[PDB]
Design a protein around this motif. Structure first.
Motif, PDB file in Angstrom:
ATOM      1  N   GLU A  86      49.401  -1.984-101.669  1.00 44.07           N
ATOM      2  CA  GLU A  86      50.461  -2.970-101.559  1.00 44.07           C
ATOM      3  C   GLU A  86      49.942  -4.351-101.104  1.00 44.07           C
ATOM      4  OE1 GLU A  86      54.270  -3.899-101.251  1.00 44.07           O
ATOM      5  OE2 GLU A  86      54.608  -2.550 -99.526  1.00 44.07           O
ATOM      6  N   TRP A 143      50.575  -8.485-101.751  1.00 39.98           N
ATOM      7  CA  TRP A 143      51.415  -9.465-102.404  1.00 39.98           C
ATOM      8  C   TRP A 143      50.673 -10.751-102.776  1.00 39.98           C
ATOM      9  CZ3 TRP A 143      54.051  -6.351-104.444  1.00 39.98           C
ATOM     10  CH2 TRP A 143      55.428  -6.383-104.695  1.00 39.98           C
ATOM     11  N   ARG A 166      70.481  -0.539-102.431  1.00 40.43           N
ATOM     12  CA  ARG A 166      70.314   0.866-102.088  1.00 40.43           C
ATOM     13  C   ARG A 166      71.621   1.640-102.107  1.00 40.43           C
ATOM     14  NH1 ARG A 166      65.967   0.539 -97.143  1.00 40.43           N
ATOM     15  NH2 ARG A 166      64.693  -1.179 -97.980  1.00 40.43           N
ATOM     16  N   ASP A 201      63.664  -3.720-102.124  1.00 38.32           N
ATOM     17  CA  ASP A 201      63.672  -5.026-101.454  1.00 38.32           C
ATOM     18  C   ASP A 201      64.175  -6.194-102.283  1.00 38.32           C
ATOM     19  OD1 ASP A 201      62.646  -4.630 -98.759  1.00 38.32           O
ATOM     20  OD2 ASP A 201      60.813  -3.939 -99.794  1.00 38.32           O
ATOM     21  N   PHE A 220      52.968  -4.900 -85.846  1.00 40.51           N
ATOM     22  CA  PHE A 220      53.096  -5.232 -87.254  1.00 40.51           C
ATOM     23  C   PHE A 220      53.213  -6.704 -87.620  1.00 40.51           C
ATOM     24  CE2 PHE A 220      53.676  -4.979 -91.618  1.00 40.51           C
ATOM     25  CZ  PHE A 220      54.961  -5.286 -92.057  1.00 40.51           C
ATOM     26  N   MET A 230      56.225  -0.669 -83.958  1.00 45.59           N
ATOM     27  CA  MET A 230      55.142  -0.515 -84.928  1.00 45.59           C
ATOM     28  C   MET A 230      53.775  -1.006 -84.445  1.00 45.59           C
ATOM     29  SD  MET A 230      57.475  -1.838 -88.053  1.00 45.59           S
ATOM     30  CE  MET A 230      56.677  -1.545 -89.568  1.00 45.59           C
TER      31      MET A 230
HETATM   32  O1  LIG Z   1      59.403 -12.440 -89.506  1.00 45.72           O
HETATM   33  C1  LIG Z   1      59.655 -11.740 -90.729  1.00 45.72           C
HETATM   34  C2  LIG Z   1      61.125 -11.253 -90.911  1.00 45.72           C
HETATM   35  O2  LIG Z   1      61.647 -10.779 -89.600  1.00 45.72           O
HETATM   36  C3  LIG Z   1      63.025 -10.252 -89.625  1.00 45.72           C
HETATM   37  O3  LIG Z   1      63.081  -9.059 -90.385  1.00 45.72           O
HETATM   38  C4  LIG Z   1      63.694  -7.842 -89.853  1.00 45.72           C
HETATM   39  C5  LIG Z   1      64.635  -7.269 -90.962  1.00 45.72           C
HETATM   40  O4  LIG Z   1      65.628  -8.237 -91.294  1.00 45.72           O
HETATM   41  C6  LIG Z   1      65.286  -5.952 -90.491  1.00 45.72           C
HETATM   42  O5  LIG Z   1      66.151  -5.435 -91.495  1.00 45.72           O
HETATM   43  C7  LIG Z   1      64.160  -4.924 -90.182  1.00 45.72           C
HETATM   44  O6  LIG Z   1      63.457  -4.705 -91.392  1.00 45.72           O
HETATM   45  C8  LIG Z   1      62.926  -3.405 -91.752  1.00 45.72           C
HETATM   46  C9  LIG Z   1      63.296  -3.140 -93.249  1.00 45.72           C
HETATM   47  O7  LIG Z   1      64.712  -3.147 -93.405  1.00 45.72           O
HETATM   48  C10 LIG Z   1      62.722  -1.800 -93.727  1.00 45.72           C
HETATM   49  O8  LIG Z   1      63.063  -1.550 -95.097  1.00 45.72           O
HETATM   50  C11 LIG Z   1      61.181  -1.843 -93.555  1.00 45.72           C
HETATM   51  O9  LIG Z   1      60.646  -2.829 -94.389  1.00 45.72           O
HETATM   52  C12 LIG Z   1      59.410  -2.562 -95.096  1.00 45.72           C
HETATM   53  C13 LIG Z   1      59.642  -2.791 -96.595  1.00 45.72           C
HETATM   54  O10 LIG Z   1      60.687  -1.938 -97.072  1.00 45.72           O
HETATM   55  C14 LIG Z   1      58.328  -2.513 -97.350  1.00 45.72           C
HETATM   56  O11 LIG Z   1      58.503  -2.702 -98.755  1.00 45.72           O
HETATM   57  C15 LIG Z   1      57.192  -3.436 -96.796  1.00 45.72           C
HETATM   58  O12 LIG Z   1      57.475  -4.795 -97.082  1.00 45.72           O
HETATM   59  C16 LIG Z   1      56.603  -5.473 -98.027  1.00 45.72           C
HETATM   60  C17 LIG Z   1      57.562  -6.212 -99.036  1.00 45.72           C
HETATM   61  O13 LIG Z   1      58.085  -5.229 -99.920  1.00 45.72           O
HETATM   62  C18 LIG Z   1      56.841  -7.317 -99.850  1.00 45.72           C
HETATM   63  O14 LIG Z   1      57.799  -8.042-100.621  1.00 45.72           O
HETATM   64  C19 LIG Z   1      56.044  -8.266 -98.916  1.00 45.72           C
HETATM   65  O15 LIG Z   1      56.921  -8.980 -98.049  1.00 45.72           O
HETATM   66  C20 LIG Z   1      56.921 -10.448 -98.080  1.00 45.72           C
HETATM   67  C21 LIG Z   1      58.326 -10.988 -98.497  1.00 45.72           C
HETATM   68  O16 LIG Z   1      58.710 -10.493 -99.785  1.00 45.72           O
HETATM   69  C22 LIG Z   1      58.293 -12.533 -98.513  1.00 45.72           C
HETATM   70  O17 LIG Z   1      59.561 -13.060 -98.899  1.00 45.72           O
HETATM   71  C23 LIG Z   1      57.867 -13.084 -97.124  1.00 45.72           C
HETATM   72  O18 LIG Z   1      58.859 -12.799 -96.166  1.00 45.72           O
HETATM   73  C24 LIG Z   1      59.582 -13.882 -95.506  1.00 45.72           C
HETATM   74  C25 LIG Z   1      61.099 -13.536 -95.678  1.00 45.72           C
HETATM   75  O19 LIG Z   1      61.495 -13.743 -97.035  1.00 45.72           O
HETATM   76  C26 LIG Z   1      62.003 -14.350 -94.724  1.00 45.72           C
HETATM   77  O20 LIG Z   1      63.359 -13.958 -94.941  1.00 45.72           O
HETATM   78  C27 LIG Z   1      61.552 -14.137 -93.239  1.00 45.72           C
HETATM   79  O21 LIG Z   1      61.642 -12.748 -92.881  1.00 45.72           O
HETATM   80  C28 LIG Z   1      62.073 -12.352 -91.531  1.00 45.72           C
HETATM   81  C29 LIG Z   1      63.516 -11.766 -91.628  1.00 45.72           C
HETATM   82  O22 LIG Z   1      64.410 -12.737 -92.175  1.00 45.72           O
HETATM   83  C30 LIG Z   1      64.008 -11.315 -90.225  1.00 45.72           C
HETATM   84  O23 LIG Z   1      65.340 -10.791 -90.294  1.00 45.72           O
HETATM   85  O24 LIG Z   1      60.190 -14.605 -93.140  1.00 45.72           O
HETATM   86  C31 LIG Z   1      59.172 -13.925 -93.962  1.00 45.72           C
HETATM   87  C32 LIG Z   1      57.872 -14.688 -93.639  1.00 45.72           C
HETATM   88  O25 LIG Z   1      56.727 -14.189 -94.322  1.00 45.72           O
HETATM   89  O26 LIG Z   1      56.585 -12.508 -96.703  1.00 45.72           O
HETATM   90  C33 LIG Z   1      56.551 -11.032 -96.662  1.00 45.72           C
HETATM   91  C34 LIG Z   1      55.156 -10.592 -96.147  1.00 45.72           C
HETATM   92  O27 LIG Z   1      54.069 -11.429 -96.559  1.00 45.72           O
HETATM   93  O28 LIG Z   1      55.084  -7.486 -98.178  1.00 45.72           O
HETATM   94  C35 LIG Z   1      55.644  -6.470 -97.260  1.00 45.72           C
HETATM   95  C36 LIG Z   1      54.437  -5.788 -96.594  1.00 45.72           C
HETATM   96  O29 LIG Z   1      53.699  -4.941 -97.493  1.00 45.72           O
HETATM   97  O30 LIG Z   1      57.039  -3.248 -95.358  1.00 45.72           O
HETATM   98  C37 LIG Z   1      58.259  -3.499 -94.592  1.00 45.72           C
HETATM   99  C38 LIG Z   1      57.914  -3.303 -93.104  1.00 45.72           C
HETATM  100  O31 LIG Z   1      56.861  -2.359 -92.893  1.00 45.72           O
HETATM  101  O32 LIG Z   1      60.854  -2.107 -92.163  1.00 45.72           O
HETATM  102  C39 LIG Z   1      61.370  -3.367 -91.584  1.00 45.72           C
HETATM  103  C40 LIG Z   1      60.890  -3.376 -90.109  1.00 45.72           C
HETATM  104  O33 LIG Z   1      59.737  -4.190 -89.894  1.00 45.72           O
HETATM  105  O34 LIG Z   1      63.275  -5.469 -89.154  1.00 45.72           O
HETATM  106  C41 LIG Z   1      62.611  -6.763 -89.474  1.00 45.72           C
HETATM  107  C42 LIG Z   1      61.724  -7.137 -88.247  1.00 45.72           C
HETATM  108  O35 LIG Z   1      62.468  -7.420 -87.059  1.00 45.72           O
END
Ligand SMILES: OC[C@H]1O[C@@H]2O[C@H]3[C@H](O)[C@@H](O)[C@@H](O[C@H]4[C@H](O)[C@@H](O)[C@@H](O[C@H]5[C@H](O)[C@@H](O)[C@@H](O[C@H]6[C@H](O)[C@@H](O)[C@@H](O[C@H]7[C@H](O)[C@@H](O)[C@@H](O[C@H]8[C@H](O)[C@@H](O)[C@@H](O[C@H]1[C@H](O)[C@H]2O)O[C@@H]8CO)O[C@@H]7CO)O[C@@H]6CO)O[C@@H]5CO)O[C@@H]4CO)O[C@@H]3CO
Length: 585
Positions: free
Chosen positions: A354, A356, A469, A421, A286, A293
C-alpha cells in the motif's frame, strides 16, 4: 535534438532482465526528437574487432512530454554492454553511451549490465496476472450468523445510511454462504480488510495477530472458508498491518505496565516513559496523535521474528497472499526478508503493498509483486466520471504510469475504481449508469489486475465513508441484474482472451476533440482492440489497422465488423458505447 532530455540507466525501469538471457532496455526522450532508436550490443568481454549486435527499439508510447522507446537485448553470455544510436527528424544521428553523447561511437562510451542472476529476475505468481480480485469488508458483506452480531447491531436494509460507528453484523460465515454468488460472477480471488482481533470498529489496531476477531468468526470457520473458497477455485488474500499494532497488543500492554523493566520496551519507539498514553504521547504512533496504534520497531530482530512467525501461522491456514497496509513505512530489509520467507512457504503467494506514491523502490523484484495502482483510478475518475480531462491527455497519464515500473510489475498492479475510502464509482458518475459501465469496460480490459469493490457489481451507490460501506444488497429484485450480467460477460472475455491478461498495451487512437480513445492488446498472434466513445453523442471514426492481425475483426459484445478497407476501419459507435474488437486468433 535536445540531448538534455534523453534519459537512461542500467537499472530500475530502464534496464532490467525478463529472463536470465533477455534484457529489456528502455529509453526516454523529448516528444518528436527521435525518429528511430537503435541499440548496438555485445558481451561485456567481446573483442573490439567483433561486429556488434543490433536491436531496433520501437516507440512504446508517449506522454505529456516524453517519448518512450523499448528494446529487447538477447544476451546468451548473461553479460552485456551496449550503446544507443539515435536518429533525428533531419537525419542527424548520435551515439549515446555511459560516457555521454557523441557522433563517434567510441567517444560515446557504453552502458553495462554486469551480470544476470536467475534469482534477480522479477518473478510474480502466474495466477495473479489473470485474476480478478474482489474486495470484501466483512462487517458489511453478509451476516450469515446473527449470533456473531455485536451489541447494538442495526437492521440489514436497502434504505440504510451508515454512520461512522454503525454495526450490521457482517461475518465470515456469510462469506461462505455467499461463495456461489461470487463464483458465478467469476471472481478469482477475495481480498479481506483486517479481520484480526481488535476492540475498535475498523480493526486496524490489531490486538492479537494470531486470532480472528470474535465478531467475524473463529479459526475453525476460517479454515472452512479457505477450503470452500479453494474448492471453487478462489484464492484468499488477507490484509496485514505490520507497521503498527493496537493499544491492546499484548507487548504494549506489558510496557505500559512494566515500563523500562519490560523486556518489550525496544519493540516500540518510546521516548521517555513511564509510557503515558493518557492523551499526549511519549511514543511514536501511526499518523500523529493516535495512541491506539503504537508503531512497531521492525528493525528490532525480536519483533521481526514475531511478525514473521505470524505470517507463518496464517500461511499454514492456506491464505494465498498478503496486502501490506502502510508498507512504505517499514524498512526495506524487513520486506526483502519477508518475501523470502513467504515465497519459500508458497511460491504462489502474492505480496501487494500500500503506497500512495511512486512505488518504484519497492517494485524491482526483491520486495513486492505489485501495489494498488492509485494512478489508474485518479485517471479514470477524471476521464469517465467528471470529464476533467480528454482522451489525448488520458493516453498520456496511462502511459506515464506504465513506464514507472518494470513490466512484470505493471501487469500485476491492482486497478481499483473505488474502495471503502472513496465513494462508489457510480456516484462519481452522478448516477449515470452509462458512464459507469464504460469505465468498467476499460477496467476489465486494460493492463493490470481488476479489483472489484463489493457491491459495485449490482449498481450500488453512496458517498464516501461511511456511506460507501452500506450493507450488501441481497434482494434479487433490488439488485441491478443488468450490471451484474454486464460484469459477468466482461470478466468472461478476460479469462478467454490471452491479450487481455497476458498481452501488452499500445496506444491506438486518441482524439482530444471527439474524446474517443482506443488501445490494442497483443500476445503472439492475438489482437484485441478496444474502442471507447466517451461522449453522449453518436459518432463514427476511422482507425488504422495494426500491421499484424488481419482484415476481419469481431466485437465480442455484439457482432462482426470486417471493415478492413485499404488499411482502415470504419466504425459507428453509439453514445458512450465501447467495442471489444478481436482479430480471431
Ligand atoms: O491527520 C489525518 C486525519 O486525521 C483525522 O482522521 C481520523 C478519522 O476521521 C477517523 O474516522 C478515524 O479513522 C480511522 C478510519 O475510519 C479507519 O477506516 C482506518 O483507516 C485506515 C484506512 O481504512 C486504510 O485504507 C489506510 O488508509 C490509507 C488510505 O486508504 C490512502 O488513501 C492513503 O491515505 C491518504 C489520503 O487518501 C489523503 O487524502 C491524505 O489524507 C489527508 C485527508 O484527506 C484530510 O482529510 C486530513 O485527514 C485527517 C482527518 O480529516 C481527521 O478526521 O489530512 C490528511 C493529511 O495527509 O493523506 C493520506 C496519507 O498519506 O494512505 C493510507 C495509509 O496507507 O489506513 C487507515 C489507518 O490505518 O483507521 C483510521 C484510524 O487511524 O481516526 C482518524 C485519526 O484520528
Amino acid at each position: 535534438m535536445l540531448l538534455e532530455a534523453i534519459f537512461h540507466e542500467a537499472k530500475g525501469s530502464y534496464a532490467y532482465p525478463i529472463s536470465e538471457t533477455q534484457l529489456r532496455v528502455r529509453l526516454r526522450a523529448k516528444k518528436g526528437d527521435v525518429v528511430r532508436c537503435e541499440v548496438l550490443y555485445a558481451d561485456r568481454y567481446a573483442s573490439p574487432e567483433e561486429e556488434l549486435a543490433h536491436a531496433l527499439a520501437g516507440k512504446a508510447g508517449s506522454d505529456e512530454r516524453f517519448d518512450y522507446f523499448e528494446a529487447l537485448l538477447e544476451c546468451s553470455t548473461k553479460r552485456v554492454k551496449y550503446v544507443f544510436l539515435l536518429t533525428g527528424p533531419q537525419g542527424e544521428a548520435v551515439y549515446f553511451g555511459e560516457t555521454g553523447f557523441s557522433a563517434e561511437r567510441s567517444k560515446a562510451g557504453v552502458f553495462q549490465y554486469a551480470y544476470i542472476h536467475r534469482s534477480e529476475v522479477f518473478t510474480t505468481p502466474e495466477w495473479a496476472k489473470e485474476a480478478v480480485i474482489y474486495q470484501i469488508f466483512p462487517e458489511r458483506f453478509a451476516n450469515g450468523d446473527p449470533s456473531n452480531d455485536p451489541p447494538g447491531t442495526e437492521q440489514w436494509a436497502k434504505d440504510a445510511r451508515p454512520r461512522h460507528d454503525s454495526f450490521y453484523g457482517g461475518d465470515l460465515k456469510g462469506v461462505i454462504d455467499r461463495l456461489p454468488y461470487l463464483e458465478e460472477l467469476g471472481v478469482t480471488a477475495l481480498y479481506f480488510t483486517p479481520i484480526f482481533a481488535s476492540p475498535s470498529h475498523h480493526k486496524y489496531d490489531t490486538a492479537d495477530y494470531l486470532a480472528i476477531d470474535p465478531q467475524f468468526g473463529d479459526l475453525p470457520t476460517f479454515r472452512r472458508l479457505v477450503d470452500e473458497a479453494h474448492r471453487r477455485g478462489i484464492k484468499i488474500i488477507l490484509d496485514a498491518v505490520f507497521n503498527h499494532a493496537g493499544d491492546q497488543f499484548f507487548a504494549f500492554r506489558d510496557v505500559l505496565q512494566k515500563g523500562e523493566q519490560s523486556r518489550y520496551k525496544d519493540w516500540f519507539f518510546i521516548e521517555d516513559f513511564p509510557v503515558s498514553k493518557t492523551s499526549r504521547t511519549n511514543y511514536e504512533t501511526f499518523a500523529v496523535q493516535v495512541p491506539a496504534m503504537p508503531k512497531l520497531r521492525t528493525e528490532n530482530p525480536e519483533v521481526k521474528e514475531y511478525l514473521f512467525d505470524v505470517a507463518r501461522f496464517w500461511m499454514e491456514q492456506g491464505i494465498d497472499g498478503w496486502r501490506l497496509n502502510v508498507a512504505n513505512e517499514v524498512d526495506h530489509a524487513f520486506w526483502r526478508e519477508f518475501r523470502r520467507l513467504v515465497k519459500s512457504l508458497n511460491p504462489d503467494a502474492l505480496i501487494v503493498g500500500e503506497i500512495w506514491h511512486d512505488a518504484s523502490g519497492w517494485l524491482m523484484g526483491d520486495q513486492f509483486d505489485s501495489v494498488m495502482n492509485y494512478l489508474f483510478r485518479e485517471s479514470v475518475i477524471r476521464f469517465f466520471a467528471t470529464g476533467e480531462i480528454h482522451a489525448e491527455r488520458f493516453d498520456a497519464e496511462l502511459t506515464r504510469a506504465r513506464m514507472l515500473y518494470p513490466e512484470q510489475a505493471a501487469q500485476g498492479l491492482w486497478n481499483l475504481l473505488d474502495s471503502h475510502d472513496t465513494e462508489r464509482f457510480l456516484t462519481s458518475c452522478g448516477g449515470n449508469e452509462a458512464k459507469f459501465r464504460l469505465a468498467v469496460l476499460f477496467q476489465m480490459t486494460y493492463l493490470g489486475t481488476p479489483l472489484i469493490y463489493y457491491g459495485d457489481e449490482i449498481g450500488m451507490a453512496g458517498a464516501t465513508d461511511p456511506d460507501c460501506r452500506r450493507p450488501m444488497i441481497w434482494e434479487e429484485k433490488e439488485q441491478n441484474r443488468g450490471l451484474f450480467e454486464f460484469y459477468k460477460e466482461l470478466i468472461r472475455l478476460r479469462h478467454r482472451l490471452a491479450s487481455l491478461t497476458r498481452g501488452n498495451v499500445r496506444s491506438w487512437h486518441a482524439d482530444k476533440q471527439a474524446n474517443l480513445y482506443a488501445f490494442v492488446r497483443t500476445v503472439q498472434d492475438q489482437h484485441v482492440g478496444v474502442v471507447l466513445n466517451n461522449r453522449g453523442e453518436k459518432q463514427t471514426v476511422l482507425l488504422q489497422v495494426p500491421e499484424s492481425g488481419g482484415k476481419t475483426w469481431l466485437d465480442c459484445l455484439t457482432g462482426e465488423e470486417v471493415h478492413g478497407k485499404q488499411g482502415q476501419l470504419k466504425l459507428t459507435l453509439r453514445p458512450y458505447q465501447g467495442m471489444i474488437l478481436w482479430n480471431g486468433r
